[PDB]
């Protein structure tokens, strides 16, 4: 249980992100992730009927 105590003492010393910085962080990462995801999804879907027509 001493390891958990040391881990908690360490976490108390860390710098948790406040709401204002967390907001910018989540906005940036969510925009990026949603963009790459929709790009991947569109590329995967568009090439299915094209592959049916051609191949």
């Amino acid at each position: 249980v001493e390891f958990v105590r040391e881990g908690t003492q360490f976490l108390a010393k860390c710098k948790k992100p406040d709401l204002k910085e967390y907001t910018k962080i989540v906005k940036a990462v969510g925009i990026g992730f949603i963009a790459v995801g929709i790009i991947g999804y569109a590329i995967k879907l568009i090439h299915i009927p094209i592959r049916y027509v051609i191949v």
């Binding site: 360490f10 976490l11 010393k13 860390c14 710098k15 948790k16 992100p17 910085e21 967390y22 962080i25 989540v26 990462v29």
Partner: peptide
Amino acid sequence: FLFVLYLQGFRYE
């Protein structure tokens, strides 16, 4: 996903 985002800001400066 949001929890991982929150857990990425933890740091010892």
